[PDB]
């Protein structure tokens, strides 16, 4: 449930997706999932308008 | 060999400078001269 906003995956905030991912699991898994979003969101936004 | 041809900027007359001469024009009193374009073949790109 919920929509992703500036407080969930934003820069300069706690309770972050990548932050919790790096705290729970290893730090290598946090960087591999940061570039996957930058390849999924922008193309869909460009094709949406 | 061939005298170096130079053009003026007021009368555009093609004269020649022989050797260590006062740089001027023989028609007018203008003291600046120009040069001719080279007679070689330069290649250009149309891209």
């Amino acid at each position: 449930s919920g929509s992703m906003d500036k407080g969930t995956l934003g820069s300069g905030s706690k309770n972050n997706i990548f932050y919790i991912l790096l705290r729970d699991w290893g730090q290598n898994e946090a960087a591999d999932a940061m570039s996957r979003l930058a390849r999924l969101a922008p193309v869909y936004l460009s094709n949406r308008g | 060999q061939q005298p170096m041809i130079y053009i003026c900027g007021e009368c555009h007359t093609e004269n020649e400078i022989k050797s260590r001469d006062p740089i001027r024009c023989r028609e007018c009193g203008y003291r600046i001269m120009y040069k001719k374009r080279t007679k070689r073949l330069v290649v250009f790109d149309a891209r």
Partner: protein, 67 residues
């Protein structure tokens, strides 16, 4: 300086109507009348002739001329 031969966006030849556009602006024609009589219908290939300055005409007065 000179009217572009082709358009920037689409690529339609717009450089063959500059002199015709000039000669048609002196027959008591409106800018829009000349632009829609020449053949231009859309606006991407219309501002090539409308908004264009001619500086080569002023640059030929300073050009070297033979005596």
């Amino acid at each position: 300086m000179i009217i572009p031969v082709r358009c920037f966006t689409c690529g339609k030849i717009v450089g063959n109507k500059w002199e015709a556009y000039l000669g048609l602006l002196q027959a008591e024609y409106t800018e829009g009348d000349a632009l829609d009589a020449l053949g231009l219908k859309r606006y991407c290939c219309r501002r090539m002739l409308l908004a264009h300055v001619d500086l080569i005409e002023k640059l030929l007065n300073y050009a070297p001329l033979e005596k």
